[PDB]
Coordinates of C-alpha atoms and ligand atoms in Angstrom, one line a residue:
Chain A
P4 CA -55.4 37.3 -69.4
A5 CA -57.4 34.6 -71.3
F6 CA -60.8 33.5 -69.8
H7 CA -62.5 30.4 -71.1
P8 CA -66.2 30.4 -69.9
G9 CA -67.5 27.1 -68.7
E10 CA -63.9 25.8 -68.3
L11 CA -61.6 25.8 -65.3
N12 CA -59.2 28.8 -65.6
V13 CA -56.2 28.6 -63.2
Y14 CA -54.5 31.9 -62.3
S15 CA -51.2 32.3 -60.4
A16 CA -50.7 36.1 -60.5
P17 CA -52.9 38.3 -58.3
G18 CA -52.9 40.7 -61.3
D19 CA -54.4 38.1 -63.7
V20 CA -57.2 37.1 -61.3
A21 CA -57.9 40.7 -60.4
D22 CA -58.4 41.8 -64.0
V23 CA -60.5 38.8 -64.9
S24 CA -62.6 39.2 -61.8
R25 CA -63.2 42.9 -62.6
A26 CA -64.0 42.3 -66.3
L27 CA -66.6 39.7 -65.3
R28 CA -68.2 42.0 -62.7
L29 CA -68.4 44.7 -65.3
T30 CA -70.3 42.4 -67.7
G31 CA -72.9 41.8 -64.9
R32 CA -71.6 38.5 -63.4
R33 CA -71.4 38.2 -59.7
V34 CA -68.1 37.1 -58.3
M35 CA -68.3 34.4 -55.5
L36 CA -65.1 33.7 -53.6
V37 CA -64.4 30.4 -51.8
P38 CA -61.1 30.8 -49.9
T39 CA -59.3 27.5 -49.2
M40 CA -56.1 26.0 -48.1
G41 CA -56.6 23.2 -50.6
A42 CA -56.9 19.6 -49.5
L43 CA -60.5 19.9 -50.5
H44 CA -63.3 17.8 -49.1
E45 CA -67.1 17.6 -49.3
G46 CA -67.5 20.6 -47.0
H47 CA -65.7 22.8 -49.6
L48 CA -67.9 21.3 -52.3
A49 CA -70.8 22.5 -50.3
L50 CA -69.3 26.0 -50.2
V51 CA -68.8 25.9 -54.0
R52 CA -72.4 24.5 -54.5
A53 CA -73.8 27.3 -52.4
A54 CA -71.7 29.8 -54.3
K55 CA -72.9 28.3 -57.7
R56 CA -76.5 28.6 -56.7
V57 CA -76.1 32.4 -56.7
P58 CA -77.7 33.4 -60.1
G59 CA -75.3 34.7 -62.8
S60 CA -72.4 33.9 -60.4
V61 CA -68.9 33.1 -61.5
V62 CA -67.1 31.1 -58.8
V63 CA -63.5 31.7 -57.6
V64 CA -61.9 29.2 -55.4
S65 CA -58.6 30.3 -54.0
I66 CA -56.0 27.8 -52.7
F67 CA -53.3 29.2 -50.6
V68 CA -51.5 28.2 -47.4
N69 CA -49.9 31.1 -45.5
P70 CA -46.5 30.8 -44.0
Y82 CA -49.6 20.6 -43.5
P83 CA -51.8 18.6 -46.2
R84 CA -51.1 19.9 -49.8
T85 CA -52.8 17.7 -52.5
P86 CA -53.5 20.0 -55.6
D87 CA -54.0 17.2 -58.3
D88 CA -57.1 16.2 -56.3
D89 CA -58.0 19.8 -55.5
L90 CA -58.2 20.9 -59.2
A91 CA -60.1 17.8 -60.5
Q92 CA -62.9 18.3 -58.0
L93 CA -63.3 21.9 -59.1
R94 CA -63.6 21.0 -62.8
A95 CA -66.3 18.5 -62.0
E96 CA -68.2 21.1 -59.9
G97 CA -68.0 23.4 -62.9
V98 CA -65.8 26.1 -61.1
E99 CA -64.5 28.5 -63.8
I100 CA -61.7 30.1 -61.7
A101 CA -59.0 28.6 -59.4
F102 CA -56.7 31.3 -57.8
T103 CA -53.4 29.6 -56.8
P104 CA -50.8 32.4 -56.0
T105 CA -47.2 31.8 -54.9
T106 CA -46.0 33.0 -51.5
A107 CA -43.7 35.5 -53.3
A108 CA -46.6 37.0 -55.2
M109 CA -48.7 37.4 -52.0
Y110 CA -45.8 38.5 -49.9
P111 CA -43.1 40.3 -52.1
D112 CA -42.2 42.5 -49.2
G113 CA -42.5 39.9 -46.5
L114 CA -44.6 40.8 -43.4
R115 CA -45.1 44.5 -43.3
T116 CA -48.6 46.2 -43.0
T117 CA -50.8 43.7 -41.1
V118 CA -54.3 43.3 -39.7
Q119 CA -54.5 43.6 -36.0
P120 CA -57.8 41.8 -34.9
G121 CA -60.0 43.0 -32.0
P122 CA -59.6 41.2 -28.5
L123 CA -61.7 38.2 -29.7
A124 CA -58.5 37.1 -31.4
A125 CA -56.8 36.6 -28.0
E126 CA -59.6 34.1 -26.7
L127 CA -60.1 30.5 -27.3
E128 CA -58.0 29.4 -30.3
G129 CA -56.1 32.7 -30.0
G130 CA -55.1 32.3 -26.3
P131 CA -51.9 30.1 -26.9
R132 CA -51.4 31.3 -30.5
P133 CA -51.3 35.1 -30.1
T134 CA -50.7 36.1 -33.8
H135 CA -52.6 33.3 -35.4
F136 CA -55.8 35.4 -36.3
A137 CA -53.7 38.4 -37.4
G138 CA -52.2 36.2 -40.0
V139 CA -55.7 34.8 -41.1
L140 CA -57.3 38.3 -41.3
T141 CA -54.3 39.7 -43.3
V142 CA -54.5 37.0 -45.9
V143 CA -58.3 37.1 -46.1
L144 CA -58.3 40.9 -46.5
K145 CA -55.7 40.4 -49.3
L146 CA -57.7 37.8 -51.1
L147 CA -60.8 40.0 -50.8
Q148 CA -59.0 43.0 -52.3
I149 CA -57.4 40.8 -55.1
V150 CA -60.6 39.2 -56.1
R151 CA -63.3 41.8 -54.9
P152 CA -66.1 39.4 -54.7
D153 CA -69.7 40.2 -54.0
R154 CA -69.9 37.3 -51.5
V155 CA -67.3 35.1 -49.8
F156 CA -68.1 31.7 -48.3
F157 CA -67.0 30.0 -45.1
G158 CA -67.9 26.8 -43.3
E159 CA -69.2 27.3 -39.7
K160 CA -66.9 24.8 -38.2
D161 CA -64.2 27.3 -37.6
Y162 CA -66.6 29.5 -36.0
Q163 CA -64.4 32.0 -34.1
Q164 CA -62.5 32.6 -37.4
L165 CA -65.8 33.2 -39.2
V166 CA -66.8 35.8 -36.5
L167 CA -63.4 37.5 -36.8
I168 CA -64.0 37.8 -40.5
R169 CA -67.4 39.4 -40.1
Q170 CA -65.5 41.8 -37.7
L171 CA -62.9 42.5 -40.4
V172 CA -65.6 43.1 -43.0
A173 CA -67.6 45.4 -40.8
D174 CA -64.7 47.3 -39.2
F175 CA -63.0 48.0 -42.6
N176 CA -66.2 48.9 -44.5
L177 CA -65.6 46.1 -46.9
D178 CA -68.2 45.8 -49.6
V179 CA -68.7 42.0 -49.6
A180 CA -71.4 39.8 -48.1
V181 CA -70.1 37.1 -45.8
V182 CA -71.9 33.7 -46.1
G183 CA -71.5 31.1 -43.3
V184 CA -72.5 27.6 -44.4
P185 CA -73.5 24.8 -42.0
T186 CA -70.7 22.3 -41.3
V187 CA -70.9 19.2 -43.5
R188 CA -70.4 16.0 -41.3
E189 CA -69.4 12.4 -41.7
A190 CA -72.2 9.9 -41.3
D191 CA -71.7 9.6 -37.5
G192 CA -71.7 13.4 -36.9
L193 CA -67.9 14.1 -37.1
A194 CA -67.3 17.7 -38.5
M195 CA -65.5 17.5 -41.9
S196 CA -61.9 18.4 -41.7
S197 CA -58.7 18.0 -43.6
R198 CA -57.1 17.1 -40.3
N199 CA -59.4 14.0 -39.7
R200 CA -57.0 12.0 -41.9
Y201 CA -54.5 12.2 -38.9
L202 CA -56.6 10.0 -36.6
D203 CA -55.8 6.3 -36.3
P204 CA -58.8 3.9 -36.1
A205 CA -59.3 4.2 -32.4
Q206 CA -59.0 8.0 -32.4
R207 CA -61.5 8.1 -35.3
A208 CA -64.0 6.0 -33.3
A209 CA -63.5 8.2 -30.3
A210 CA -63.7 11.5 -32.3
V211 CA -67.5 11.2 -32.7
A212 CA -67.7 12.4 -29.0
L213 CA -67.3 16.0 -29.9
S214 CA -70.4 16.1 -32.2
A215 CA -72.2 13.7 -29.8
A216 CA -71.4 16.0 -26.8
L217 CA -72.6 19.1 -28.6
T218 CA -75.9 17.6 -29.8
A219 CA -76.4 16.2 -26.3
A220 CA -76.0 19.7 -25.0
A221 CA -78.3 21.2 -27.6
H222 CA -81.2 18.9 -26.4
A223 CA -80.3 19.1 -22.8
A224 CA -80.5 22.9 -22.9
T225 CA -84.3 23.0 -22.3
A226 CA -83.1 22.4 -18.7
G227 CA -80.8 25.5 -18.9
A228 CA -77.2 26.3 -19.6
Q229 CA -75.5 24.3 -16.8
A230 CA -77.4 21.2 -17.7
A231 CA -76.3 21.7 -21.4
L232 CA -72.7 22.1 -20.4
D233 CA -72.7 19.1 -18.0
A234 CA -74.3 16.8 -20.6
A235 CA -71.5 17.7 -23.2
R236 CA -68.8 17.3 -20.5
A237 CA -70.0 13.8 -19.5
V238 CA -70.0 12.6 -23.1
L239 CA -66.4 14.0 -23.6
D240 CA -65.3 12.4 -20.3
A241 CA -66.8 9.0 -21.3
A242 CA -64.6 9.0 -24.4
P243 CA -61.2 7.3 -24.4
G244 CA -58.1 9.4 -25.2
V245 CA -60.1 12.6 -25.7
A246 CA -58.4 15.5 -23.9
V247 CA -60.5 18.7 -23.8
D248 CA -58.8 22.1 -24.3
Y249 CA -62.0 24.0 -23.9
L250 CA -65.8 23.6 -24.0
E251 CA -67.5 27.0 -23.8
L252 CA -70.9 28.4 -24.3
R253 CA -71.1 32.0 -25.6
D254 CA -73.2 34.7 -27.2
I255 CA -73.3 34.0 -31.1
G256 CA -70.9 37.0 -31.6
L257 CA -68.6 35.2 -29.0
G258 CA -68.6 38.2 -26.5
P259 CA -68.3 40.7 -24.7
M260 CA -72.0 40.0 -24.3
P261 CA -73.5 37.6 -21.7
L262 CA -75.2 34.7 -23.3
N263 CA -79.1 35.2 -23.4
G264 CA -81.4 32.3 -24.6
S265 CA -79.4 31.7 -27.8
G266 CA -75.7 31.0 -28.2
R267 CA -73.0 28.9 -29.6
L268 CA -71.4 26.0 -27.9
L269 CA -67.7 25.5 -28.9
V270 CA -65.4 22.7 -28.2
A271 CA -61.7 21.9 -29.0
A272 CA -60.1 18.7 -28.0
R273 CA -56.8 16.7 -28.7
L274 CA -56.7 13.1 -29.8
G275 CA -53.1 12.1 -29.6
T276 CA -51.5 15.0 -31.5
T277 CA -54.5 16.0 -33.5
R278 CA -56.6 19.0 -32.4
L279 CA -60.3 18.9 -33.5
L280 CA -62.8 21.7 -33.2
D281 CA -66.6 21.7 -33.4
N282 CA -69.5 23.9 -32.5
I283 CA -73.2 24.2 -32.6
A284 CA -76.1 26.6 -32.1
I285 CA -77.7 26.3 -28.7
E286 CA -81.1 27.7 -27.5
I287 CA -81.4 27.9 -23.6
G288 CA -84.9 27.1 -22.2
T289 CA -85.1 25.7 -25.8
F290 CA -86.3 28.6 -27.7
Chain B
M1 CA -81.8 49.9 -53.2
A2 CA -82.6 53.4 -54.5
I3 CA -79.5 55.5 -54.9
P4 CA -79.4 58.6 -52.7
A5 CA -80.0 62.0 -54.3
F6 CA -76.9 63.4 -56.3
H7 CA -77.0 66.6 -58.4
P8 CA -74.1 66.9 -60.9
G9 CA -72.3 70.2 -61.0
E10 CA -73.0 71.1 -57.4
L11 CA -71.9 70.4 -53.8
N12 CA -73.5 67.2 -52.4
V13 CA -72.9 66.6 -48.7
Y14 CA -73.3 63.1 -47.2
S15 CA -72.6 62.1 -43.7
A16 CA -73.7 58.5 -43.9
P17 CA -70.9 56.2 -45.1
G18 CA -73.5 54.0 -47.0
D19 CA -74.8 57.0 -48.9
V20 CA -71.4 58.1 -50.2
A21 CA -70.6 54.5 -51.0
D22 CA -73.8 54.3 -53.0
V23 CA -73.2 57.6 -54.8
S24 CA -69.6 56.7 -55.6
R25 CA -70.6 53.3 -57.0
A26 CA -73.4 54.9 -59.1
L27 CA -70.9 57.4 -60.3
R28 CA -68.1 55.1 -61.6
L29 CA -70.7 52.9 -63.3
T30 CA -71.7 55.9 -65.4
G31 CA -68.2 56.8 -66.6
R32 CA -66.8 59.2 -63.9
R33 CA -63.5 58.6 -62.3
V34 CA -63.7 59.0 -58.5
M35 CA -61.0 61.1 -56.8
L36 CA -60.6 61.2 -53.0
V37 CA -59.1 64.0 -51.0
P38 CA -59.0 63.2 -47.4
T39 CA -58.9 66.2 -45.0
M40 CA -59.5 67.0 -41.3
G41 CA -61.3 70.2 -42.4
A42 CA -60.0 73.7 -41.5
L43 CA -59.2 73.8 -45.2
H44 CA -56.2 75.8 -46.5
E45 CA -54.3 76.3 -49.7
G46 CA -52.6 73.0 -49.3
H47 CA -56.0 71.3 -49.6
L48 CA -57.0 73.4 -52.5
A49 CA -53.9 72.1 -54.3
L50 CA -54.9 68.5 -53.6
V51 CA -58.3 69.4 -55.0
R52 CA -57.0 71.2 -58.1
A53 CA -54.8 68.1 -58.9
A54 CA -57.9 65.9 -58.5
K55 CA -60.2 68.1 -60.7
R56 CA -57.7 68.0 -63.6
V57 CA -58.2 64.2 -64.2
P58 CA -60.6 64.0 -67.2
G59 CA -64.0 62.9 -66.1
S60 CA -63.1 63.2 -62.4
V61 CA -65.7 63.6 -59.7
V62 CA -64.1 64.9 -56.5
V63 CA -64.8 63.6 -53.1
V64 CA -63.4 65.5 -50.1
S65 CA -63.8 63.8 -46.8
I66 CA -63.9 65.9 -43.6
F67 CA -63.3 63.8 -40.6
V68 CA -61.5 64.3 -37.4
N69 CA -60.2 61.0 -36.2
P70 CA -60.0 60.8 -32.3
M71 CA -57.7 57.7 -32.8
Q72 CA -55.5 59.5 -35.5
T85 CA -64.3 77.1 -40.8
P86 CA -67.3 74.5 -41.3
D87 CA -70.1 76.0 -43.5
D88 CA -67.0 77.9 -44.4
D89 CA -65.0 74.7 -45.5
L90 CA -68.1 73.7 -47.5
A91 CA -68.2 77.2 -49.1
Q92 CA -64.5 76.8 -50.1
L93 CA -65.3 73.4 -51.7
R94 CA -68.3 75.0 -53.6
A95 CA -66.0 77.7 -54.9
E96 CA -63.7 75.0 -56.2
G97 CA -66.4 73.0 -58.0
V98 CA -66.1 70.0 -55.7
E99 CA -69.1 67.8 -56.2
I100 CA -69.0 65.6 -53.0
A101 CA -68.1 66.3 -49.4
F102 CA -68.2 63.3 -47.0
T103 CA -68.7 64.5 -43.5
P104 CA -69.3 61.4 -41.2
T105 CA -69.7 61.4 -37.4
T106 CA -67.4 59.5 -35.1
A107 CA -70.3 57.1 -34.4
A108 CA -70.8 56.4 -38.2
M109 CA -67.1 55.7 -38.7
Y110 CA -66.8 53.6 -35.6
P111 CA -70.2 52.1 -34.9
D112 CA -68.7 49.1 -33.1
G113 CA -66.0 51.3 -31.4
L114 CA -62.4 50.4 -31.9
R115 CA -61.9 46.8 -32.9
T116 CA -60.1 45.5 -36.0
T117 CA -57.3 48.0 -36.8
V118 CA -54.3 48.3 -39.2
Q119 CA -51.0 47.5 -37.8
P120 CA -48.2 49.4 -39.8
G121 CA -44.9 47.9 -40.8
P122 CA -41.6 48.8 -38.7
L123 CA -41.3 52.2 -40.5
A124 CA -44.1 53.4 -38.2
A125 CA -41.8 53.0 -35.2
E126 CA -39.1 55.4 -36.7
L127 CA -38.9 59.1 -37.1
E128 CA -42.3 60.5 -36.2
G129 CA -43.2 57.2 -34.7
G130 CA -40.6 58.0 -32.0
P131 CA -42.6 60.8 -30.4
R132 CA -46.1 59.3 -31.4
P133 CA -45.8 55.4 -31.4
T134 CA -49.3 54.5 -32.4
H135 CA -50.1 57.6 -34.4
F136 CA -49.8 55.9 -37.8
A137 CA -51.8 52.8 -36.8
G138 CA -54.7 55.3 -36.3
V139 CA -54.0 57.1 -39.6
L140 CA -53.7 53.9 -41.7
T141 CA -56.9 52.5 -40.2
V142 CA -59.0 55.5 -41.0
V143 CA -57.4 55.8 -44.5
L144 CA -58.2 52.1 -45.2
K145 CA -61.8 52.8 -44.1
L146 CA -62.2 55.9 -46.2
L147 CA -60.7 54.0 -49.2
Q148 CA -63.2 51.2 -48.8
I149 CA -66.2 53.5 -48.4
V150 CA -65.4 55.7 -51.3
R151 CA -63.6 53.3 -53.5
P152 CA -61.8 56.0 -55.4
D153 CA -59.6 55.4 -58.5
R154 CA -57.0 57.9 -57.1
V155 CA -56.3 59.3 -53.7
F156 CA -54.4 62.6 -53.1
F157 CA -52.1 63.5 -50.2
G158 CA -49.6 66.4 -49.7
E159 CA -45.9 65.4 -49.5
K160 CA -45.5 67.4 -46.3
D161 CA -46.0 64.5 -44.0
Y162 CA -43.7 62.3 -46.1
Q163 CA -43.4 59.3 -43.7
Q164 CA -47.2 59.2 -43.5
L165 CA -47.4 59.1 -47.3
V166 CA -44.8 56.3 -47.6
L167 CA -46.7 54.3 -45.0
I168 CA -50.0 54.7 -47.0
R169 CA -48.2 53.5 -50.1
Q170 CA -47.1 50.5 -48.0
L171 CA -50.8 50.0 -47.0
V172 CA -52.0 50.0 -50.6
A173 CA -49.2 47.7 -51.7
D174 CA -49.5 45.3 -48.8
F175 CA -53.3 44.9 -48.9
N176 CA -53.5 44.9 -52.7
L177 CA -55.8 47.9 -52.8
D178 CA -56.9 49.0 -56.2
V179 CA -56.3 52.7 -55.9
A180 CA -53.5 55.0 -57.2
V181 CA -51.8 57.1 -54.5
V182 CA -50.9 60.6 -55.7
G183 CA -48.5 62.7 -53.6
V184 CA -48.8 66.4 -54.4
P185 CA -45.8 68.7 -53.8
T186 CA -46.0 70.6 -50.5
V187 CA -47.6 74.1 -50.8
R188 CA -45.4 76.7 -49.0
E189 CA -45.7 80.3 -47.7
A190 CA -43.8 83.1 -49.6
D191 CA -40.6 82.5 -47.6
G192 CA -40.8 78.6 -48.0
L193 CA -42.4 77.6 -44.8
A194 CA -44.4 74.4 -45.4
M195 CA -48.1 75.1 -44.9
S196 CA -49.4 73.7 -41.7
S197 CA -52.4 74.3 -39.4
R198 CA -49.8 74.9 -36.7
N199 CA -48.1 77.8 -38.3
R200 CA -50.7 80.4 -37.0
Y201 CA -49.6 79.5 -33.4
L202 CA -46.0 80.7 -33.9
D203 CA -45.3 84.2 -32.5
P204 CA -43.3 86.5 -34.8
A205 CA -39.9 85.3 -33.5
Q206 CA -40.8 81.6 -33.9
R207 CA -42.3 82.3 -37.3
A208 CA -39.1 84.0 -38.4
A209 CA -37.0 81.2 -37.1
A210 CA -39.3 78.5 -38.6
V211 CA -38.1 79.5 -42.1
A212 CA -34.8 77.7 -41.2
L213 CA -36.4 74.3 -41.8
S214 CA -37.2 74.9 -45.5
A215 CA -34.0 77.0 -45.9
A216 CA -31.9 74.1 -44.6
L217 CA -33.5 71.6 -46.8
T218 CA -33.3 73.7 -50.1
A219 CA -29.6 74.5 -49.2
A220 CA -28.9 70.8 -48.8
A221 CA -30.6 69.9 -52.1
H222 CA -28.4 72.4 -54.0
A223 CA -25.3 71.4 -52.0
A224 CA -25.9 67.7 -53.0
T225 CA -23.7 68.0 -56.1
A226 CA -20.9 67.9 -53.6
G227 CA -22.3 64.7 -52.1
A228 CA -24.2 63.5 -49.0
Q229 CA -22.1 64.8 -46.3
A230 CA -22.0 68.2 -47.9
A231 CA -25.8 68.2 -48.2
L232 CA -26.3 67.2 -44.5
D233 CA -23.7 69.7 -43.2
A234 CA -25.3 72.5 -45.2
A235 CA -28.7 71.7 -43.7
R236 CA -27.3 71.5 -40.2
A237 CA -25.4 74.8 -40.6
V238 CA -28.6 76.5 -41.6
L239 CA -30.5 74.9 -38.6
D240 CA -27.6 75.9 -36.3
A241 CA -28.0 79.6 -37.4
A242 CA -31.6 79.7 -35.9
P243 CA -32.4 80.4 -32.2
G244 CA -35.2 78.3 -30.4
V245 CA -35.2 75.5 -33.0
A246 CA -34.8 72.2 -31.3
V247 CA -34.2 69.6 -34.0
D248 CA -35.5 66.2 -33.2
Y249 CA -34.0 64.6 -36.4
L250 CA -32.5 65.5 -39.7
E251 CA -32.2 62.3 -41.9
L252 CA -31.3 61.5 -45.4
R253 CA -33.0 58.3 -46.6
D254 CA -34.0 56.7 -49.9
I255 CA -37.4 57.6 -51.4
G256 CA -39.0 54.6 -49.6
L257 CA -37.4 55.7 -46.3
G258 CA -34.9 52.9 -46.1
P259 CA -31.3 53.8 -46.1
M260 CA -29.9 56.3 -48.5
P261 CA -28.2 54.4 -51.5
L262 CA -24.5 55.1 -52.6
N263 CA -25.8 57.7 -55.1
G264 CA -29.3 58.2 -56.6
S265 CA -32.6 59.6 -55.5
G266 CA -33.3 60.4 -51.8
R267 CA -35.4 62.3 -49.4
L268 CA -34.2 64.6 -46.6
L269 CA -36.5 64.9 -43.7
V270 CA -36.4 67.2 -40.7
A271 CA -38.4 67.7 -37.5
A272 CA -38.1 70.4 -34.8
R273 CA -39.8 72.0 -31.9
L274 CA -40.3 75.8 -31.7
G275 CA -41.7 76.6 -28.2
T276 CA -44.6 74.2 -28.0
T277 CA -45.2 73.6 -31.7
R278 CA -43.7 70.7 -33.6
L279 CA -42.8 71.4 -37.3
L280 CA -41.8 68.9 -40.1
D281 CA -40.6 69.3 -43.7
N282 CA -38.8 67.2 -46.2
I283 CA -37.4 67.5 -49.7
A284 CA -36.2 65.5 -52.7
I285 CA -32.4 65.0 -52.8
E286 CA -30.3 63.8 -55.7
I287 CA -26.8 62.6 -54.9
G288 CA -24.0 64.1 -57.0
Ligands
LIG1 C1 -69.3 23.4 -45.1 O1 -68.8 22.4 -44.3 C2 -67.5 22.6 -44.1 C3 -67.0 21.9 -43.0 C4 -65.6 22.0 -42.6 C5 -64.9 23.0 -43.3 C6 -65.4 23.7 -44.3 C7 -66.7 23.6 -44.7 C8 -64.3 24.5 -44.7 C9 -63.3 24.2 -43.9 C10 -62.0 24.8 -44.0 O2 -61.3 24.9 -42.9 N1 -61.4 25.0 -45.2 S1 -59.9 25.4 -45.3 O3 -59.0 25.3 -44.1 O4 -59.3 25.3 -46.6 C11 -59.9 27.2 -44.9 C12 -59.1 27.6 -43.9 C13 -59.0 29.0 -43.5 C14 -59.7 29.9 -44.3 C15 -59.6 31.4 -44.1 F1 -60.6 31.9 -43.4 F2 -58.4 31.8 -43.6 F3 -59.6 31.9 -45.4 C16 -60.6 29.5 -45.3 C17 -60.7 28.1 -45.6 N2 -63.6 23.3 -43.0 C18 -62.9 22.6 -41.9 C19 -61.6 22.0 -42.1 O5 -61.3 21.5 -43.2 O6 -61.0 21.8 -41.0
LIG2 C1 -49.3 37.7 -26.5 O1 -47.9 37.3 -26.5 C2 -47.3 37.6 -27.7 C3 -46.1 37.0 -28.1 C4 -45.6 37.4 -29.3 C5 -46.1 38.3 -30.1 C6 -47.3 38.9 -29.7 C7 -47.8 38.6 -28.5 C8 -47.6 39.8 -30.6 C9 -46.7 39.7 -31.6 C10 -46.8 40.5 -32.7 O2 -47.6 41.4 -32.8 N1 -45.9 40.3 -33.6 S1 -45.8 41.4 -34.8 O3 -44.8 41.2 -35.9 O4 -47.0 42.4 -34.9 C11 -46.9 40.3 -36.0 C12 -48.1 40.8 -36.5 C13 -48.8 40.0 -37.4 C14 -48.3 38.8 -37.8 C15 -49.1 38.0 -38.8 F1 -49.7 36.9 -38.2 F2 -49.9 38.8 -39.4 F3 -48.4 37.6 -39.7 C16 -47.1 38.3 -37.3 C17 -46.4 39.0 -36.4 N2 -45.8 38.8 -31.3 C18 -44.6 38.5 -32.1 C19 -43.5 39.6 -31.9 O5 -43.7 40.5 -31.1 O6 -42.4 39.5 -32.5
LIG3 C1 -50.4 70.3 -51.0 O1 -49.7 70.7 -49.8 C2 -50.1 70.5 -48.6 C3 -49.4 71.1 -47.5 C4 -49.8 70.8 -46.2 C5 -50.8 70.0 -45.9 C6 -51.5 69.4 -46.9 C7 -51.1 69.6 -48.2 C8 -52.4 68.6 -46.3 C9 -52.3 68.8 -45.0 C10 -53.1 68.2 -44.0 O2 -52.6 67.6 -43.0 N1 -54.4 68.0 -44.2 S1 -55.1 67.4 -43.0 O3 -54.6 67.1 -41.7 O4 -56.6 67.8 -42.8 C11 -55.0 65.6 -43.2 C12 -54.7 64.7 -42.1 C13 -54.5 63.3 -42.2 C14 -54.8 62.7 -43.4 C15 -54.7 61.3 -43.6 F1 -53.6 60.8 -44.2 F2 -55.0 60.7 -42.4 F3 -55.8 60.8 -44.4 C16 -55.1 63.5 -44.5 C17 -55.2 64.9 -44.4 N2 -51.3 69.6 -44.7 C18 -50.6 70.1 -43.4 C19 -51.6 70.6 -42.4 O5 -52.6 71.2 -42.8 O6 -51.3 70.5 -41.2

């Protein structure tokens, strides 16, 4: 396959990107992977920028939706402007020629929180991520921290399968009021958008409240969520940073998921208890 | 950062996954092609054939792993490897392989529920997980298995296809005793009557293969007849399938697989079949 350095090369076939990726690595370049479902926003640009600041790196951004917002004219233009040299955009047929066959079965974390009502959801995420990792074989792969449980499951996948890639979590880029960036924010009417600030407001309230201990942190977050119109909370949980089965100590992660109309929003934050 | 000690032309034993990973990387960067022979130790002639097939690749360095998977002849095994010119034995502990215990695993496609998956329903999940791990630690160019456990071999090829692994899977024809009995650690348990009756499995299969000019029913009936002539041979299945273990086509290449119990020992064998 042709590679044009300092231009955006778009590859469809896993074979093409795999050969280009390996050739590059051989000539000393480090391969950075940013896996996406497209519909790119500023948080993705932050993943790319962090990937680009890795010296001698070549950046690969993949755009692929398993089997939703699909806007690839926008997606590609942004990459060219950030100076990304590789977009990997495979077909479903190329990723899944045999359909669903060999799969990743996540540990029990995958049955908690987001996984509780969606029992195969993380199996599907870990299977596609493993496949992207094997196609591309990057040195480092980048994720936003907003989908924190998913990021922890990925660290599990990488440890548990001895995968030779460094996983980089990048702090969640926010709108000016604190709203975690998300593709799905577009689905909020003006009143829902106004109210949605409560998730991030609740979590920062909790993070400062936590000097007074874990119950006070939780109750602060809960009062903010309850003060907000049309916000229905699925969960609000405080956990170890690995998300269990450890009891929380002095440091943890506070996670929330809520529905505004039909739109589910997630957010999370670091929390120190007895602030520390 | 510093590569662990490796001495070309002799036997280098590592028990730490990170060490073998580092040696193997260092080796392929200097030209060598890395060949992986996974074993559970207690080496026999079947393993020495996997080994000889590996050594014959120009520029090969040979990694034999020795690992008994609880989820699935010592200084002696190592002596055998030395006498074969094997340069790397990988001998990890259970703790090294599973430092976080059992967590993320491989879930096999539906083939794992058939045939051997009938008696042992999660056996292949355990095999595919350890094989994925060994492949990721060693990162070989080629990996060598006997054709004796044929279903296991097909499932591994599904693993490799499905997860986009960049390794070649090499199946090496089954090594057999003088009378045709497929080498197996279990053979030494058979008393003389069982041992004499056991020849029926390979006898049935070769008869079928030669009968196949007369078609599929003729092949199967010949095999059955031969099995029916043996006392104490309790056949769990005798099945003709295509080379991928889906259903046998009209006419073309196939595989005939058999499994049976003699006293307390379970024996398997299989053979290439050509219809017509
Ligand atoms: C650095 O700041 C941010 C903030 C939010 C982010 C991101 C970065 C990245 C995402 C995100 O979800 N991207 S995405 O859905 O295309 C995505 C989804 C799933 C996976 C995974 F793990 F399966 F490969 C990767 C990217 N998201 C959240 C989102 O768009 O909902
Ligand atoms: C906890 O309650 C449930 C309900 C349904 C479940 C399960 C659990 C588990 C499965 C399941 O494992 N399905 S299956 O084909 O293994 C599977 C595995 C992986 C994927 C994925 F997401 F990778 F694509 C889909 C289905 N399934 C789907 C099934 O058994 O067909
Ligand atoms: C070239 O011909 C042969 C003939 C028989 C063989 C072999 C090769 C290899 C074996 C064998 O099982 N080796 S082993 O159990 O130590 C083994 C077990 C499991 C795996 C796997 F796939 F999990 F990686 C590999 C080797 N066996 C059968 C046995 O020893 O029971």
